[PDB]
Design a protein around this ligand. Sequence first.
Ligand SMILES: [Mg+2]
Ligand SMILES: [Mg+2]
Ligand SMILES: [Mg+2]
Ligand SMILES: [Mg+2]
Ligand SMILES: [Mg+2]
Ligand SMILES: [Mg+2]
Ligand SMILES: [Mg+2]
Ligand SMILES: [Mg+2]
Ligand SMILES: [Mg+2]
Ligand SMILES: [Mg+2]
Ligand SMILES: [Mg+2]
Ligand SMILES: [Mg+2]
Ligand SMILES: [Mg+2]
Ligand SMILES: [Mg+2]
Ligand SMILES: [Mg+2]
Ligand SMILES: [Mg+2]
Ligand SMILES: [Mg+2]
Ligand SMILES: [Mg+2]
Ligand SMILES: [Mg+2]
Ligand SMILES: [Mg+2]
Ligand SMILES: [Mg+2]
Ligand SMILES: [Mg+2]
Ligand SMILES: [Mg+2]
Ligand SMILES: [Mg+2]
Ligand SMILES: [Mg+2]
Ligand SMILES: [Mg+2]
Ligand SMILES: [Mg+2]
Ligand SMILES: [Mg+2]
Ligand SMILES: [Mg+2]
Ligand SMILES: [Mg+2]
Ligand SMILES: [Mg+2]
Ligand SMILES: [Mg+2]
Ligand SMILES: [Mg+2]
Ligand SMILES: [Mg+2]
Ligand SMILES: [Mg+2]
Ligand SMILES: [Mg+2]
Ligand SMILES: [Mg+2]
Ligand SMILES: [Mg+2]
Ligand SMILES: [Mg+2]
Ligand SMILES: [Mg+2]
Ligand SMILES: [Mg+2]
Lengths: 206, 60, 263
Amino acid sequence: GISRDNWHKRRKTGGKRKPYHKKRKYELGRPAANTKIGPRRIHTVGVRGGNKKYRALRLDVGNFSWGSECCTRKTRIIDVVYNASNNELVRTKTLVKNCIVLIDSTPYRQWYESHYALPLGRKKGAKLTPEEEEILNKKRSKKIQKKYDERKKNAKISSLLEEQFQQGKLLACIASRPGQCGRADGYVLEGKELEFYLRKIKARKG
Amino acid sequence: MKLNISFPATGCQKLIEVDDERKLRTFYEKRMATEVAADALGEEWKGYVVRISGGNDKQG
Amino acid sequence: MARGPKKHLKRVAAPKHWMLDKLTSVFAPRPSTGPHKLRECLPLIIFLRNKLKYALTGDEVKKICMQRFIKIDGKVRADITYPAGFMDVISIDKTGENFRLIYDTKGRFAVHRITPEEAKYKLCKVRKIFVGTKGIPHLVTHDARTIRYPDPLIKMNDTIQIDLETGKITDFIKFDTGNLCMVTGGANLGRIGVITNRERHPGSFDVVHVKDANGNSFATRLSNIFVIGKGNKPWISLPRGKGIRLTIAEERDKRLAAKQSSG
RNA sequence: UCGCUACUACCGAUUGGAUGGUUUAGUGAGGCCCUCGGAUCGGCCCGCCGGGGUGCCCUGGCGGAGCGCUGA
RNA sequence: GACGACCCAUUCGAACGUCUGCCCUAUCAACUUUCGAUGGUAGUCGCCGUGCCUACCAUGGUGACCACGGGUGACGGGGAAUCAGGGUUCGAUUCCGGAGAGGGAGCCUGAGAAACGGCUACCACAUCCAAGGAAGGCAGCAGGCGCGCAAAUUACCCACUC
RNA sequence: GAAACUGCGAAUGGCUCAUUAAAUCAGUUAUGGUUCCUUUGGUCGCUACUUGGAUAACUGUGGUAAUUC
Ligand SMILES: [Mg+2]
Ligand SMILES: [Mg+2]
Ligand SMILES: [Mg+2]
Ligand SMILES: [Mg+2]
Ligand SMILES: [Mg+2]
Ligand SMILES: [Mg+2]
Ligand SMILES: [Mg+2]
Ligand SMILES: [Mg+2]
Ligand SMILES: [Mg+2]
Ligand SMILES: [Mg+2]
Ligand SMILES: [Mg+2]
Ligand SMILES: [Mg+2]
Ligand SMILES: [Mg+2]
Ligand SMILES: [Mg+2]
Ligand SMILES: [Mg+2]
Ligand SMILES: [Mg+2]
Ligand SMILES: [Mg+2]
Ligand SMILES: [Mg+2]
Ligand SMILES: [Mg+2]
Ligand SMILES: [Mg+2]
Ligand SMILES: [Mg+2]
Ligand SMILES: [Mg+2]
Ligand SMILES: [Mg+2]
Ligand SMILES: [Mg+2]
Ligand SMILES: [Mg+2]
Ligand SMILES: [Mg+2]
Ligand SMILES: [Mg+2]
Ligand SMILES: [Mg+2]
Ligand SMILES: [Mg+2]
Ligand SMILES: [Mg+2]
Ligand SMILES: [Mg+2]
Ligand SMILES: [Mg+2]
Ligand SMILES: [Mg+2]
Ligand SMILES: [Mg+2]
Ligand SMILES: [Mg+2]
Ligand SMILES: [Mg+2]
Ligand SMILES: [Mg+2]
Ligand SMILES: [Mg+2]
Ligand SMILES: [Mg+2]
Ligand SMILES: [Mg+2]
Ligand SMILES: [Mg+2]
């Protein structure tokens, strides 16, 4: 079937080479996965030596990380925004390594408000009266100075990141190959990477 | 065509030959694993329910 | 043609230090996978039926081994193509005799009966020192043995004497200039001497010099040195000749002048 | 030079033939992958009986309903 | 004791790479390139490195020191015949390596196969049929037809080597 | 102890030289860029006095000109 052999190529001089043998099995095919977004399905391929290998199709949940905070959570993947290799991989919402994805951003908000005792980007406060000010402004006399005042000074999320938390989504990069592992892990963009990718996105579409 | 009747209660089988197509009209155009009333195959068969389980073509 | 691993060995392609004929047949024992490499081992059938003449065919050595008589390094081996190798100990207690496979002088194994008190330990060369989970130091010796928790001052190319019954490294000799050694590969396969030098070529094949007990010098690669003593004092018992390699002229003079024909 | 016999190679209408090797364009068996498909086969949940307990429950069996969920 | 088993090391390998080494031919002097040619970035796939393949860029790469094309009654080597010194010719063939099972192609199982003493199709042959259907691969050992100037028994045995 | 289920082997060996001209192959090195049944050595603790249904062989009825159907 499909083959990865070197012997169908021209040699460096531009000359043809003639084959000496039929196609082997250590030179195999196995067409692409083309992971979409949706309810999970994962098939399993038997490869050289045994060693099953998981090929994902329609993943919808990932394990992403925030490196400044060292805080990693399970999250939902919403959409793909950028793709350095092709552009038809954003029209079809296929999810490959080094893609740029939107995630749900909620568990990071939960951990942040719980760890710092301080809010994210919030517009108005009425929902904070029955609940959430319960977490953020917890009724305790011990700790609530000594601990959380050492949590403060450090709780200075940058302009772009705190602007992200308002619309309820983030920008993340996949750092794992879902076609080989069946997992869509990665890390949320920050700093100059975030600026570069935001400018690229703004420049491409529209 | 012939039939191979099997009673899974007492463990007894018997082959039967039936030529007149009228008796056979009960089974025509009916896939395997469907139960029918075999009381059309005779008068000893009155309150009988049979399940088709397979067979062989001409040429086997 | 060759879609998998092979399992036959032709008599003409077998190692030469087995000292086989060329008229018995097309085939050779083909030692089974073990702790010693294929070209550097000595199967059980060849050691028993060819060097010891205890057996006369392959059936006889099979039915000698199938009676739990032969012990290699303490344990009872039932296979007749087991790859016994350097510094091993054979034990046949039905007759009360123990041997030790060591190259004599001419690049082949000898028959080297030893005392039963000496057939308890064996010397092993260290090839690898790595750390496992939870920071446990491991060893790897020249015969695939793995030792956990060695004292953290034994390194590569050092020799360790181990008890055959329990593992449990007992003592060790250090690779240094001045230590007795036997060469276990190449052209000087069998000669014994002191180190006196170690040339170093970063990236490939650091060579080592040797000078035996008669002022003769010869070099080898570091991959073939085997420290067997502190210096001028072996830890295992040396065979007859003691790796001296007297030349063909001296060979002829000693074979003629002694008139070694019979008793 | 012309003439006789014999042998060899050449040009050539025949728009020759045989065997092939590439090859535009069109079709395309069969396997593999993906998205569907759903012939059939079971389990779960409710009465009567047999076995155990407190009119009901548990294994099982029977006829069945809802065939509702459900797995291959 | 037997068996089984995740992982690491060892053994037996397998695969992909480095440097150097080749018969005749110019009545073969320029070749290669969206039908990847040479390189760059991101990926797909693969046991893994890699234009292996895709997207976007750059315009490169080889050659008179013989590239590129053609021929070989060319499998390579260890080796064989001849030989003052140098050389010339041979190596289908018992050891090592490669390739194939009528010709191509595609797969299952498996640690390991693109396996043919396995399977599925097309082409070429060819067998039985109750004409609906079924079955095939001796470049294994014997044997047979054909081809030729040209090459053996349809024998006995696992006693030896494995 | 027949048969049958199960485990393993059938990728070795044997044969031939059609293809193949930096291809194979030979000496030399590299996997710090990979996989490896088996062998040898290390590793084995974060209704339980033992669970479920269901197929062979075997018994019995058959189909086809014909098969290791
Ligand atoms: Mg070929
Ligand atoms: Mg494995
Ligand atoms: Mg072979
Ligand atoms: Mg063997
Ligand atoms: Mg004439
Ligand atoms: Mg054509
Ligand atoms: Mg097509
Ligand atoms: Mg198709
Ligand atoms: Mg690239
Ligand atoms: Mg890459
Ligand atoms: Mg150019
Ligand atoms: Mg050329
Ligand atoms: Mg050519
Ligand atoms: Mg040829
Ligand atoms: Mg030649
Ligand atoms: Mg000469
Ligand atoms: Mg040859
Ligand atoms: Mg030929
Ligand atoms: Mg021959
Ligand atoms: Mg090779
Ligand atoms: Mg083949
Ligand atoms: Mg043929
Ligand atoms: Mg297996
Ligand atoms: Mg094939
Ligand atoms: Mg074969
Ligand atoms: Mg067959
Ligand atoms: Mg055959
Ligand atoms: Mg023949
Ligand atoms: Mg003739
Ligand atoms: Mg002749
Ligand atoms: Mg003849
Ligand atoms: Mg035999
Ligand atoms: Mg028995
Ligand atoms: Mg086995
Ligand atoms: Mg197998
Ligand atoms: Mg022959
Ligand atoms: Mg050529
Ligand atoms: Mg080369
Ligand atoms: Mg080589
Ligand atoms: Mg080489
Ligand atoms: Mg083990």
